[PDB]
Symmetry: C2
Subunit: 348 residues, 2 copies
């Protein structure tokens, strides 16, 4: 083969389905055509998989259209077939997979888990890191245990009493009642009263089986794109302003910029991330830098902060994508070596 086969996964049974498609389109449009034969795997709303092997068609049409036209081919997977994991319902090659499903299934380790079972190289966080970063309270647990400054939180599960919690949190710290693992605004509720609190708790437990309460923090929402495996690099910080308006130009001191970058890298490492993460911070008026979230499959559309921050840092998106693919393949190669050496040792 003269080119590497790249499969971009998008859609999925996730409320970020449409953003996923837009991310995938940018990636497909931006992948160096000289280096890659690009296939797009579309997962529809009921979880059916389709393969589109003409990237140009994916850029030109909605995947739903391609399904209906018949050009997007129903596929399943071929276990054990390391080279050609996709099988028409004819097998198709994949040298590396770019999981670009946001939220449920895509960032929560599920898709990563399938890809591990297929022994395929894939971009970004592995199963464990995806799961840790997906559950925001678990992320903070790991970060704080390692000494990384985070926005404080309080986890509640359905069996916990809700009475007294509001007051105790007010005493400790307006609050947010948030699903631990859901991003949609439907699952993040601002509360100003006890009554609002318990109503919000009830509401969020209709969506997620665990929630977290957070203090509403005054400060700027600063983001930083991290890239790498073992030796992560951090972009220039960007800012988002909920109405959201975004910009890669924020006027932070040399000190704060440096902190954001270093903590982003340290956080990335602390949750054992791979490939990429967008680390989202609050920076308080007193310039305290606080991690709020690590996103392992950040938006990747042409206006999305992750690629925009890198571009603003001197890394054009095509090069970014090449690096993500290289990192993915390198991780896979290293993991395969460890596995095999252990296998030999263990049975001997």
């Amino acid at each position: 083969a003269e080119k590497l086969h790249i499969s971009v996964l998008c859609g999925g049974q996730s409320t970020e389905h449409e953003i996923s498609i837009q991310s995938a389109k940018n990636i497909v449009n931006t992948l160096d055509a000289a280096k890659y034969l690009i296939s797009v795997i579309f997962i529809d709303h009921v979880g059916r998989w389709y393969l589109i092997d003409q990237p140009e068609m994916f850029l030109a049409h909605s995947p739903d259209h391609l399904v209906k036209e018949g050009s997007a081919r129903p596929i399943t997977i071929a276990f054990g077939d390391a080279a050609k994991p996709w099988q028409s319902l004819r097998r198709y090659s994949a040298d590396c997979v770019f999981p670009m499903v946001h939220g449920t299934q895509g960032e929560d380790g599920a898709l990563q888990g399938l890809l591990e079972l297929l022994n395929l190289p894939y971009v970004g966080a592995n199963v464990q890191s995806s799961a840790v970063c997906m559950e925001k309270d678990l992320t903070k647990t790991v970060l704080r245990a390692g000494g990384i400054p985070v926005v404080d939180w309080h986890t509640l599960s359905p069996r916990d009493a809700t009475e007294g919690v509001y007051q105790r949190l007010l005493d400790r710290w307006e609050l947010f009642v948030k699903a631990v693992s859901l991003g949609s605004s439907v699952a993040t509720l601002p509360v100003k009263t006890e009554t609002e609190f318990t109503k919000a708790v009830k509401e969020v437990f209709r969506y997620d089986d665990r929630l977290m309460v957070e203090p509403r923090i005054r400060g700027r929402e600063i983001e930083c794109a991290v890239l790498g495996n073992g030796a992560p690099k951090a972009s220039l910080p960007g800012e988002i302003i909920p109405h959201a308006t975004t910009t890669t130009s924020v006027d932070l001191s040399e000190s704060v910029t440096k902190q954001i970058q270093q903590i982003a890298i340290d956080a990335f490492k602390m949750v054992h991330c791979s490939g990429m993460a967008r680390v989202d911070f609050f920076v308080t008026p007193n310039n305290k830098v606080l991690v709020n979230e690590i996103n392992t499959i950040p938006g990747f559309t042409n206006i999305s902060m992750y690629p925009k921050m890198w571009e603003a840092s001197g890394l054009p998106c095509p090069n970014l994508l090449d690096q993500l693919i290289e990192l993915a393949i390198d991780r896979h190669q290293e993991q395969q070596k460890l596995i095999r050496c252990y296998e030999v040792k263990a049975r001997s």
Copy 2:
């Protein structure tokens, strides 16, 4: 009857124990309640379906593969599909792959993608329990007592580390363990600086992260936890040979339950402890797919606690289906909103 698919084998060093766990499960599942299929994953990651449980009980899966009774399958995104075009039902999956790919969230991830009910810890909880330093990180953060540890990664300098751990733990005898691997070859006792440095090197050939722990003197005690939101603990068992103080017993059971909840486990886990001579109770590991063979501690501890294996299995399946039902409700409600 409900269709139960028991998944075993796997690309894992615990492949053979997995087969034995599965055989016990298939042997013990109530025939009146279940139509049992076995999914066998071979060493190279190929998947096979055996729809005659008695064949699986009578023969090794490798034999069935060679004979052809273990049919190559893939998934249909009736989750299993032959490679006749036939599709096979599954109402609940019993993943029984130990260690790599079985307890580390990957298999759970696939089952999640397929919207199948399945027994045991979910992706997140599997991943947290699989990597032992992460488990301890989460447990200690929540105030659960655990054996001390120090994680090392390949890029960390080793110089002076041994001495520092000696100073922290007041013992010269340590273990250098892979964070995510169970074989004895990935757990190395060290008692000198030289042994430490050699062990670190050795383990880094097998895992990308390792953990150092002090050698703890005391009894190896285990405890089976069962349930979802309302876990119950078995009477403690001990590893000396295995076997199934009222205060210490209570600490064990309670800490096992609290540990189970703290890692957001579901269905089952075996919580492994040390109990020092001074009666200090320390969690060392949580196993989300513990051995399930006819002599394995998890089912034996339950049997000893008044819960026979067939009934244990029924509850595991009921817990899985119930979890699945609640999870679907949540995601449907969220999707609507």
